[PDB]
Amino acid sequence: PRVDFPRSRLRFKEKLGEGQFGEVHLCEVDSPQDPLLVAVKILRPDATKNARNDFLKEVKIMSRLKDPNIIRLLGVCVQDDPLCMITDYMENGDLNQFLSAHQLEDKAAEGAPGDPTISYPMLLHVAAQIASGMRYLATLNFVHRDLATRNCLVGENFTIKIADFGMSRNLYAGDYYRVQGRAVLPIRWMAWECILMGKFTTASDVWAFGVTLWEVLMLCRAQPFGQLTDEQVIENAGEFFRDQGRQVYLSRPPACPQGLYELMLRCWSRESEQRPPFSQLHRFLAEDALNTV
Ligand SMILES: COc1ccc2c(n1)C1(CCN(C(=O)c3ccc4[nH]ncc4c3)CC1)C(=O)N2CC(=O)N1CCC[C@H]1C(F)(F)F
Ligand SMILES: [Cl-]
């Protein structure tokens, strides 16, 4: 049984987010002997028995995860109240808002440090870290179910970590299909068998990664299928099922060469078994994509 982090050492500084059962604060750790900034998730002030149960379950889930490109618990406080989970502070926030504030470079390495520009090789590097994170989760047979740039965090030096904020942020409400007034399904990231059969697998996470890769190469300027309605996106899932060549795909991003786009298309194969494994996606993004055509 791991020992609790010493709660008294936290200095609460700013609120970073609010989710379904917890809320996240930026904290300073008063002199770190085993300015240090960490993110700390605690129960919402309106927490009921249901919220505490959900929080204790998440501690269990998070205890499974140990990879540089996945959120990791730096510590916990669970033996007594208040309950806390502690992770690294990622100073550049979510990847969607981050990339949207950048523009693609003209020539490689032409700008000054700090400028809001980004290279194609850096887009590859961001995607490759996401693929490495997902490759890790696949080995634990952990199915994420909501991969997208909004659920990735950005630290120093463009390091990426996969998280899962839930469907709670007003900022991203448009990314979720609603049933009975609440967000339920990120349909624009969902494989046709997720929509039609309710089947979530590693291969559907591969489909979502394809959309996330599309997002990254679009520098998060547009929503997937952004000029189609939710009903049309759901209808498109039906055309994948019927397989008579009426299905439509996300278009090739301007910044994306044809070779990379064809691998993206493979992520959206009708048959789950034909989609690439995350091992192959990572190898391509990390090495083959640097090849000169
Ligand atoms: C502090 O302790 C925790 C513990 C868990 C989580 C979290 N914190 C956040 C971390 C981002 N988050 C911010 O509100 C947030 C916002 C800005 C920030 N900057 N630096 C850190 C940070 C965190 C929601 C809670 C989050 O998503 N979760 C879920 C999570 O990671 N899950 C759920 C299943 C397994 C795993 C995943 F990805 F693999 F699916
Ligand atoms: Cl569109």
The Cα 232–Cα 174 span in angstroms is: 15
Biggest distance spanned by C-alpha atoms of the chain = 64
Range 2-11, long-range pairs (CB < 8 A, 24+ positions): 2/76, 4/75, 4/76, 4/77, 4/78, 4/79, 4/80, 5/74, 5/75, 5/76, 5/77, 5/84, 5/86, 7/77, 7/82, 7/84, 10/38, 10/40, 10/84
Q: Cα–Cα–Cα angle for 145, 47, 165, nearest 5°?
A: 25
Strands 117-118 and 103-104: parallel
Q: How many CB atoms are closer than 10 A to CB 108? A: 9
Just give the CATH number of 90-288: 1.10.510.10
Range 174-183, long-range pairs (CB < 8 A, 24+ positions): 174/223, 175/148, 175/150, 175/223, 177/230, 177/234
How far does residue 167's CA lie from ligand 1's centre (Å)?
A: 12
| Closest CA relative to residue 87, chosen from 68, 67, 71 | 71
Within a 13 Å sphere around the CA of 116, how many CA atoms are in the beta-carbon half? 9
The Cα 242–Cα 80 span in angstroms is: 55
The Cα 238–Cα 10 span in angstroms is: 51
Q: Which residues lie across from 183 on neighbouring strands?
A: 178
Q: Cα–Cα–Cα angle for 14, 18, 19, nearest 5°?
A: 150
Q: Name the experimental technique.
A: X-ray
Residue with the smallest CA separation from ligand 1 atom 19 is: 90
Residue 37 DSSP symbol: E
The Cα 60–Cα 165 span in angstroms is: 17
Q: Which ligand lies nearest the alpha carbon of 5?
A: 1
CA distances to 191, 224, 270 from 249, in Å: 12, 10, 12
Resolution (A): 1.8
- Show me where the domains of the chain are located: 1-89, 90-288
Residues with CB under 6 A from ligand 1: 16-17, 19, 24, 39-41, 58, 61-62, 65, 70-71, 85-87, 89-90, 93, 144, 153, 162-165
CB 79 within 8 A of CB 4: yes
Question: What is the atom index within ligand 1 of the atom nearest the CA of 165?
Answer: 27
Give the H/E segment covering residue 60: helix 49-62
| Closest CA relative to residue 267, chosen from 127, 100, 151, 95 | 127
Residue 156 is assigned to a ligand binding site: no
Q: How many CB atoms are closer than 10 A to CB 185? A: 20
Q: Which of 164, 169, 171, 202 best tests ligand 1's pocket when mutated (most atoms within 8 Å of CB)? A: 164
Instruction: Provide φ and ψ at 148, rounded to 5°.
Output: -175, 160
Q: Which residue type is seen at 48?
A: T
The fold for domain 1-89 equals Phosphorylase Kinase; domain 1 (3.30.200)
Strands 182-185 and 10-18: unpaired
Q: Which ligand lies nearest the alpha carbon of 130?
A: 1
How far does residue 160's CA lie from ligand 1's centre (Å)?
A: 13
CB 205 within 8 A of CB 241: no
Return the residue matching tokens 């989760």: 137
Q: How many CB atoms are closer than 10 A to CB 28? A: 16
